[PDB]
Design a binder for this molecule. Structure first.
Ligand code: 6FJ
Ligand code: 6FJ
Lengths: 211, 211
């Protein structure tokens, strides 16, 4: 049912550095997740040009930002190419390791945590604001899967029986107690305008009804 | 033998804007070409993880910068995944068109030409410094091809009978008469240090012997 995997030492060290170090400019996590979403959307759109059947699982190519004050979650949903089980399990591999080492070496040399995206490990900036990250994904060539990590040196992968998404990836950030500003409409709007103004797909910021 | 194609109106308009407008910060072309090279290198390295036979065409993953004062050419060579004939012919398609329109709209709104890479059309910044660009490419699944454009609204594609490269892409910039600074060792070293310091592959700047 649930498979548990250990992160390689370098990635676990990176996650520990991110989830703990004193760094106030945490807003940069959103640009990194939106950029990965945009890259996945480019991937499926390219495939759709020579094969219109690749969009049978959903024609719309977009990014949705869904805050939930009750659950204390910020969800980033995209209708990109998605990830197979193998993509989830092999996501933290050889290239992620080289990028982590280079990033760590850059930080020792005076670089800033906001430069994380230049090393291909931008996703891990999610741990600046989240105590746990759940990733639900669906690729045309595989079943729906849930990946999850609380940065304790391991991650889990299981088949997902939740609401079927047609195709794409949903990143659920279970926010840290002191990071609820990232659930506010004004705050999210400010960050998207500042760092993700030129993303080539519609970014819809959902609003919440009164509880 | 040689096939000639017209660029869509939007891309031809972009190339004309780049090859003509007054913009002094031309050095940004190198970061764009190196970034595309790094992306192609990531692509072949990922494939090599589950299939070591993908590297039969060459194990080394690197970027070489080769100035030639005699020919007035700056060549950017990479051993990335390369491009098939279809990749060369379809390179200026639907996504390139949307990115061009968004870029043009951003420029009208006060954006700078250095932001070109955010729209997925960074390659075209080559025309800030080059009067003509020749691209030799080899993908594992196809033969060696030469793509070429002098930004006159068309490009050519032909099979390439030159020195066989194992795999990857070679971008030959035929520099404009007043852009020979990009053939100088000190100048190229400065640009690579300023804009491409964190690229995850070795960048070798070749030096020239005395003529
Ligand atoms: C969810 N994660 C982190 C993680 C934990 C487990 C596996 O990945 C991400 O980085 C991430 C991945 C994709 C994705 N879907 N399809 C695909 O090619 N990508 C992809 C895109 C850009 C770099 C890498 C990618 F895979 C996405 O749409 C959003 C994301 O936030
Ligand atoms: C040579 N051109 C311009 C053009 C004219 C005709 C076709 O392309 C480039 O952009 C370009 C492309 C690659 C490449 N090889 N394989 C692959 O996937 N890419 C690729 C990488 C990043 C975005 C797009 C890409 F295709 C490269 O290694 C270097 C390059 O400078």
């Amino acid at each position: 049912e649930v498979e548990t995997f250990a992160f390689q030492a370098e990635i676990a060290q990176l996650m520990s550095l991110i989830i703990n170090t004193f760094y106030s400019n945490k807003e940069i996590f959103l640009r990194e997740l939106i950029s990965n979403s945009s890259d996945a959307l480019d991937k499926i759109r390219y495939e759709s040009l020579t094969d219109p059947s690749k969009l049978d699982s959903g024609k719309e190519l977009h990014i949705n930002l869904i805050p939930n004050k009750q659950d204390r979650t910020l969800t980033i949903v995209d209708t990109g190419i998605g990830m197979t089980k193998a993509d989830l399990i092999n996501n933290a591999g050889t290239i992620a390791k080289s990028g982590t080492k280079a990033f760590m070496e850059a930080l020792q040399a005076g670089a800033d945590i906001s430069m994380i995206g230049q090393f291909g490990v931008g996703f891990y900036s999610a741990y600046l604001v989240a105590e746990k990250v759940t990733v639900i994904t669906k690729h045309n060539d595989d079943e729906q899967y849930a990946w999850e990590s609380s940065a304790g040196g391991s991650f889990t992968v299981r088949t997902d029986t939740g609401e079927p998404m047609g195709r794409g990836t949903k990143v659920i950030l279970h926010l840290k107690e002191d990071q609820t500003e990232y659930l506010e409409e004004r705050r999210i709007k400010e960050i998207v305008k500042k760092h993700s103004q030129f993303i080539g797909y519609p970014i819809t910021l959902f609003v919440e009804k009164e509880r």
